[PDB]
Design an enzyme around this catalytic site. Sequence first.
Site, short mmCIF file in Angstrom:
data_model
loop_
_atom_site.label_atom_id
_atom_site.label_comp_id
_atom_site.label_asym_id
_atom_site.label_seq_id
_atom_site.Cartn_x
_atom_site.Cartn_y
_atom_site.Cartn_z
CG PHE A 178 -17.25 38.80 -18.55
CD1 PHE A 178 -16.19 39.24 -19.34
CD2 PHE A 178 -17.65 39.60 -17.48
CE1 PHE A 178 -15.54 40.46 -19.06
CE2 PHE A 178 -17.00 40.81 -17.20
CZ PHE A 178 -15.95 41.23 -17.99
CG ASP B 232 -18.67 45.31 -14.47
OD1 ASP B 232 -18.76 46.39 -15.08
OD2 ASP B 232 -19.00 44.21 -14.97
#
Lengths: 291, 290, 278, 288
Positions: D35, D146
């Site tokens: 990201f 995650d």
Amino acid sequence: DTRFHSFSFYELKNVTNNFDERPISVGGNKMGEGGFGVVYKGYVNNTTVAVKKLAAMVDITTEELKQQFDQEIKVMAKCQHENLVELLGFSSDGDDLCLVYVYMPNGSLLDRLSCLDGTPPLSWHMRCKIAQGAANGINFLHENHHIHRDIKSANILLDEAFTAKISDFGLARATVMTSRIVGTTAYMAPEALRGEITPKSDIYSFGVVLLEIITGLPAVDEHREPQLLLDIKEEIEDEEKTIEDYIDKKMNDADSTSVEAMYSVASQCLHEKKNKRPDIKKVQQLLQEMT
Amino acid sequence: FHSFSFYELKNVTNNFDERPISVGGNKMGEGGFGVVYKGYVNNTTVAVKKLAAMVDITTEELKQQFDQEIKVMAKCQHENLVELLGFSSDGDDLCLVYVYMPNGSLLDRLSCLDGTPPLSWHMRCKIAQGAANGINFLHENHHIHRDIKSANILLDEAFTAKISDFGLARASQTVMTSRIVGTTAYMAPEALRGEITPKSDIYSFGVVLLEIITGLPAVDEHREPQLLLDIKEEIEDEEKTIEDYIDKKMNDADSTSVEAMYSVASQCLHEKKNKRPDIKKVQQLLQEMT
Amino acid sequence: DTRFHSFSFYELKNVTNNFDERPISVGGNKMGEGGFGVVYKGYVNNTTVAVKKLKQQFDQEIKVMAKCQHENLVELLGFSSDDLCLVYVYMPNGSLLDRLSCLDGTPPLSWHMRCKIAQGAANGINFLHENHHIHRDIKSANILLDEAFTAKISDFGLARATVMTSRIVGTTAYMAPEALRGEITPKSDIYSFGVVLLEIITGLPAVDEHREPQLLLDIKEEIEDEEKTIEDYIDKKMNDADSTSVEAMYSVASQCLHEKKNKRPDIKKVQQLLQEMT
Amino acid sequence: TRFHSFSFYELKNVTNNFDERPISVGGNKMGEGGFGVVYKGYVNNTTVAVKKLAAITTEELKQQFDQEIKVMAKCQHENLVELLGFSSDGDDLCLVYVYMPNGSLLDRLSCLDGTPPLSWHMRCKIAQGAANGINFLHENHHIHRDIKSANILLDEAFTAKISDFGLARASTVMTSRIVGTTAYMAPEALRGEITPKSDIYSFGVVLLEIITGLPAVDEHREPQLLLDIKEEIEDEEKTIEDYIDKKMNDADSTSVEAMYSVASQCLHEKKNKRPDIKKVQQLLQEMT
Ligand SMILES: CC(C)(O)[C@H](F)CN1Cc2cc(NC(=O)c3cnn4cccnc34)c(N3CCOCC3)cc2C1=O
Ligand SMILES: CC(C)(O)[C@H](F)CN1Cc2cc(NC(=O)c3cnn4cccnc34)c(N3CCOCC3)cc2C1=O
Ligand SMILES: CC(C)(O)[C@H](F)CN1Cc2cc(NC(=O)c3cnn4cccnc34)c(N3CCOCC3)cc2C1=O
Ligand SMILES: CC(C)(O)[C@H](F)CN1Cc2cc(NC(=O)c3cnn4cccnc34)c(N3CCOCC3)cc2C1=O
């Protein structure tokens, strides 16, 4: 006003490996000591706790230690705040008086500043958060008409996020004078050494704590010149030194502007004339402006 | 060694940027013979020393020390010695370029300068061993360092000790000099009188071992005693114990090995140069300690 | 010291704590093995030594090591025959193979140190070839590293003073095509050195049974057929590699790895190319 | 809480206009994630890490930025990264954190950039710290989703800091958009369910990475997935000793076996048979 859980003295004995006096680093339960008792690590009702087993480690009586036990519970029953330690319960049934607290994973500010047991040094960012948090704790006490009377870095504890938590309320009082002069002389205001009881003395002691935060130096060191950390104020004032000469070398993020701002608060707290010191609200404001 | 042009080293070090590396500058530290800067040369991180007479020495003496350091480094390669890569001598400037030491000096790691974590007792023992191995290499190879101090014991990424600063080194019957140069707090009495002997390197190494045990600097003007070597007499007179002085910034220091390191330190610090152990003995004692 | 020492088996048994088979990293005396014996750490006359506890290869090793004394070759200091043992000067940084794998927690070698090791190893092979000796087992397990990380070529049991042999010996993953077919030539040592150079660039062992490709020399073809680049394989455990000198070392390795033995550089050209690299 | 709002212009000054040269050669780029790219910088004398967000759709990325700020506002702990501020002006999104001098656990296990192998003693402390961070998140009713060694950061003293909260969820639920890193994911997470039990499984993969020094996935390795060594050891075709990282010298067999037992428990194929994070913390506390 909080009503506390009563712990069995035997349950506390069980959860501290029989108050195992060996240090926690070795494999024991002893975490440290102060003038009014030994603190042990415990594991009760599925949680890590701190267990203080009271003992007159300073020149005070059995009755005085009992009145401090009662005073501590009364202060904790009345005062709950983000920057005050939290009492979980107590024991008075067995062989010794005990107080059970929420565990402080990072011990005292005094030990973190000295890097006791090899802990990593506190950054300037962390030190600013700690100074602000300790001032917030004192502000809550003063707003609620309580005088701490024993402000020192050994009584400022650090939690899992290094949030400052003021501890040790046995001497707290909710300008008057006393015949029993108590405290750590390296932190005491001149009027406190004489027997006066005032919130202005808490301010002075907090100024010493701020000097410890800036320098990483203990408040007293017999083998150092000056022996009293509070004497560095005159060294700087009479231009024989700068705060840059005393700044702790164990940080990489300090900046001269905010260090000078914290030193200015400390210098104001350390005014020898109690009425010229800032009150805690002004201290809070100045430390908020610092960052 | 690579001969650089001074302008190349100006580029490498961002014009010898005086801000500390801790805040994105290039300055790493200073010593009696110059200031050391960080740089990158062809992707290699380097340490660049820009020589300057920062103590009371002449410019001709500084040039002689520069030539001497290069000569020693051309002859002496060992894992417990710093490695020279190059230099610059064009114009009126002198620079020395070294393989970068990621953990800086032992002096700074003992003081936890810039907020580095305190060294464990286990690591301090390996560093004392490594530094003794470096001094043994120099003495075996007929060189007297003359400037042993913790600011001159560097540490790589794995805290391997590397002896540095060879500008005063002499090839080695005790000779005398008329130019007494060194850091007073580490110097043997005979070295302060101008004698040149490897026995003085042992003495200075003794001071280093006390810094390792205590975490205290060799000198502190605002401390009693001002000189760390004075604690040996305090302990001998029984007014103090080594336990009273042990660094409290460790939790793995067993009394046995600490007393064993102190005994090596005490022996190195013998006032009479001929009663000190030689470096081979110091090596074996530090080996027996662990 | 200036003489070879004949040691009794009892002394070598004593100094190795009875040939303690536990690795040195756990408090034993075993340092390594593979092929013709186990090597132990010993302490004789306040000096650390390496003791190889293993006949033709024993006599050949003593003979070649007494004749071949050079700064980039391991030093024999003594022997024992009265089990057969060879005693050598201790190499404090062990093998290049182990330093490339960071065995036992050693830090990765820098590109600068790797270039010096490549030069040193080529100087040792140059001494052997100048003196009409063929190593026959050039590999990173046979390049030892002293207290200054100076390259010291080891293992001379197979060394020979183009002929063919009935006994095909060596380490498969490093061997030249003609060496695998029985030819005995110094041109095969050059090929094996090219494999070592790929190990130095990539930090990958010549063979890894749990890797794809299992054999490192195939990388030359992957790069030649433009399916990969030397950058894809450069050891990520270095922070000081530069494209220019890495390409220069790769070029030397590629020349060493010519399938046709006559197209390979001789050791003197290899030394020259590695000198020009730095 | 009180996060400082930076302008994108100030962050360009902090990062030398997001200098893409790696920090290992004097630049500002430290690495990338799914990201965004992370850069080194200084705000006055404070070293910072600046994540410049980059693509998922722009609204999904903006949601993750918003979620990151909310988790960080609510959660402060020594085993969690600390957010100092952000920039949201124009069409750029940045997050500014306290710099982590030893980068990620994934990179320290691979010895990226020439760092020395982590000792067994240090690996034990890191495992404990990471478990303490996950415990704090779970106690605060957040599912990370995650957990992986790239998201476990390490400060100057190798204190473990959990990072990347963009995908965190409040708290068994199911989801259409399956997110995470396959090599670390529990079977039920791969089927789309959202549970804190999947964070435990992922932490078990991290424990195998700590023991072996091997990445969770290696396309050029046999077996490709590290989690598969558990079955090899179960079927006695391999041992824990066969897989122990050879780049260590201080690993005692008893505590390695104790960490492996914790990892095996976390990797239970049955989500409800896995220990909860408090049990994982206790087991790791007993190990040392
Ligand atoms: C980072 C580390 C090394 O692993 C950590 F530093 C170990 N710990 C934990 C700890 C908790 C304490 N205390 C508490 O947890 C506590 C909680 N409420 N409370 C109230 C009064 C006194 N102590 C406490 C005290 N105290 C001992 C008495 O003096 C004050 C500090 C000391 C320590 C200590 O060293
Ligand atoms: C905090 C940290 C990230 O952990 C680390 F500490 C930062 N560093 C690296 C460093 C390298 C130095 N030096 C070298 O890299 C070096 C290499 N060869 N050499 C030769 C002479 C002087 N210095 C060197 C010196 N020296 C400066 C001069 O005085 C001695 C220490 C200091 C430092 C320093 O603070
Ligand atoms: C940095 C460190 C981790 O502490 C260090 F790496 C420990 N050491 C020392 C050492 C010396 C060796 N050897 C020698 O000292 C040696 C000397 N002559 N010689 C000749 C043939 C084989 N070995 C030797 C071998 N060899 C064992 C056999 O295979 C090759 C490597 C291995 C090691 C080792 O691991
Ligand atoms: C080799 C060395 C000198 O020893 C050291 F390793 C160099 N460093 C420092 C560093 C910090 C990072 N990051 C941070 O400081 C950081 C702080 N908060 N934060 C939050 C999200 C992402 N990264 C961070 C990241 N991250 C890059 C993005 O992926 C994760 C690792 C990588 C590195 C790195 O290689």
